[PDB]
UniProtKB/Swiss-Prot annotation:
Record-given protein name: Flavonol 7-O-rhamnosyltransferase
Active site annotation, chain numbering: H15 (proton acceptor), D113 (charge relay)
Effect of W302A: Reduces catalytic activity 6.5-fold
Domain of life: Eukaryota
Enzyme class, broadest EC rank: transferase
Consequence when changing S157A: Slight decrease in catalytic activity
Record's function text: Flavonol 7-O-rhamnosyltransferase that catalyzes the transfer of rhamnose from UDP-rhamnose to the 7-OH position of 3-O-glycosylated flavonols, such as kaempferol 3-O-rhamnoside, kaempferol 3-O-glucoside, quercetin 3-O-glucoside, quercetin 3-O-galactoside, quercetin 3-O-rhamnoside and isorhamnetin 3-O-glucoside. Is able to glycosylate the flavonols quercetin and kaempferol to yield quercetin 7-O-rhamnoside and kaempferol 7-O-rhamnoside. Shows a strict specificity for UDP-rhamnose as sugar donor. Does not act on 3-O-glycosylated anthocyanins.
A GO MF term: UDP-glycosyltransferase activity
The protein's annotated pathway: Flavonoid metabolism
Amino acid sequence: KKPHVLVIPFPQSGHMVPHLDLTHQILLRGATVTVLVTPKNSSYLDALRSLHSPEHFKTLILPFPSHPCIPSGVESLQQLPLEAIVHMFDALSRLHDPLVDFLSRQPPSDLPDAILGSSFLSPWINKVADAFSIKSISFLPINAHSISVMWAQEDRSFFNDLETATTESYGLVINSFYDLEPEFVETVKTRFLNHHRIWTVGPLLPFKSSIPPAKVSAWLDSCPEDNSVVYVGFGSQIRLTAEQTAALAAALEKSSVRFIWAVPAGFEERVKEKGLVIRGWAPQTMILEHRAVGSYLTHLGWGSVLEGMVGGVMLLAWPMQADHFFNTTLIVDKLRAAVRVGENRDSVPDSDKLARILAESAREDLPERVTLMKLREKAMEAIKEGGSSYKNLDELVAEMCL
């Protein structure tokens, strides 16, 4: 017996991509899933659709409910400011009625053994699940340390409903692995889940612009030295000031390392044929996995951490939004597996106390790199057969059958 699972992801890519990586994981273990999405997000499901038949994999596209504080044709958080997350909560809560009407029509046999939807949508998903007495398992792309700090806040702002709803769900799946933060998985399991089901499942991995992906790799292979090129790649929303962009640009120039800057700049695109600046979509996972890339200058969002860990690079941390600081606390301060180069959203670095940092960052001797590599070895063990994430994938799938 294998379960049918209604997957309801959150339309921001930090959530969507691991949530679809986990659905792929589920489908490999024999489940059949249907994915509910909004129309402008149907393209996201193209990879999945190419890999499993309509027999096992199904789309349920519902119209995006309107809301006057979201501009039209905007159905995902990549396109609007960090405040409007509350507006996207309000809009997608109005898929409640369309979703109950869809499930009420199915033959009761066809109804899902479980819903595996975002923890962010749990306030209404849990009501849908209860109505049909279905398992409601939540998902998070953030780690247990972050969940720990967030759930403990006495003022959880407008995350109060979804955090409360997540604590009330059947259980919670997260994109981390146990040996990375076991204290924090255990706090979450005991302190913030009413039942006590947490599945660490990470690192969830892909199952795979101005310059094409085939040409960046030719430039990477042009690099003679292994472990010798620094990738600077900042993820949305926050863009840098003209002053911050100019500071980092002088750091990369004066540093005279080879670099790839994925993005004002100035004179400097043609100045240094040691650096390559790409505008738009960047083959990120491909860059960090190349032997020539030895450090990664990032805000230290969680997906960035696991990409850099799994790719085995020095993480240079410049946190600016809350999750970035939790991860700095974890990866830099507590684990000494990364180096801090920026303080916060308004910092302006000095051009060669950072260029010094960069030109010495890819070097394999420094303790942060050696700690990060031991963590990478732990991360590999978790997803291989026998590892805790693998087993938690097996156990989660048998659990949804209950």
